């Protein structure tokens, strides 16, 4: 919803209640890298004329976008580093910044693991420089969270993909939200009466 309501972009320009417009550029671009899919991510920045200049003004913010489309995994640590230092000082991001850290991780891992059906972590050391056990426990905790299922062979240094998630995850959202919803109405049902 944030990026959707941010679609007006430059049409609001500089405003007192909108504070700094240069910083509005950065706030509106920080949300577009999550909920916006890659075709649509470049659809907004490349096709949108009003937003193309403001990104050209700041070379640091532009670096993250074009490096994200470039798929280079060496810069993502350095670029998200700056993004994380700005995330700390700026307000309202204190609660939410730690989720963002892993968000961009899985968003890079998506495009990563979708290219090859069989992959080795030793190859990932070249792009990450150099992850060995780092990405081991990392990816393990991404898998345990049901985020981008992929089967990794331990001590054999093999990663497998799959995952045809359109089966279980299609039907899993129903149970995940259904349980919480009905457990809410259970309380409201026992409230009345007494």
């Amino acid at each position: 919803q944030a990026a959707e309501l941010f679609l007006d972009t430059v049409s609001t320009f500089t405003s007192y209640e909108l504070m700094d417009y240069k910083t509005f550029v950065t706030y509106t671009v920080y949300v577009s890298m999550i909920a916006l899919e890659r075709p649509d991510l470049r659809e907004k920045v490349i096709k949108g004329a009003e937003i193309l200049e403001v990104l050209h003004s700041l070379p640091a913010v532009r670096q993250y976008l074009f490096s994200l489309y470039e798929c280079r995994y060496s810069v993502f640590f350095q670029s998200l580093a700056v993004v994380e230092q700005e995330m700390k000082k700026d307000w309202l991001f204190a609660p939410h910044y730690r989720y963002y850290v892993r968000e961009m991780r899985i968003h890079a891992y998506s495009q990563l693991l979708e290219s090859y059906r069989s992959l080795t972590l030793g190859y990932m050391a070249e792009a990450f420089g150099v992850g060995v056990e780092f990405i081991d426990q990392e990816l393990s905790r991404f898998i345990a969270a049901g985020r981008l299922h992929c089967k990794i062979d331990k001590v054999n240094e093999i990663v497998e993909t799959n995952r045809p998630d359109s089966k279980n995850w299609q039907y899993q959202e129903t149970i995940k939200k259904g349980d919480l919803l009905l457990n809410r109405v259970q309380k409201l049902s026992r409230v009345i009466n007494m």
Partner: protein, 50 residues
């Protein structure tokens, strides 16, 4: 015969009177802010309010 009534003139549109009223009618139509309301009003001398 000058008796009796209140005299109030109806003025023609003026430049400075064109600026604010321009914004007023422009409140309902989506547009960006790169529009210069100063130069656009001087191009329209006379004409009318409507």
């Amino acid at each position: 015969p000058g008796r009796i009534d209140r005299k109030i003139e109806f003025p023609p549109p003026n430049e400075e009177a064109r600026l604010d009223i321009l914004k007023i009618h422009s409140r309902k139509m989506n547009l960006t802010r790169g529009i210069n309301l100063r130069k656009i009003a001087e191009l329209m001398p006379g004409a009318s309010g409507a």
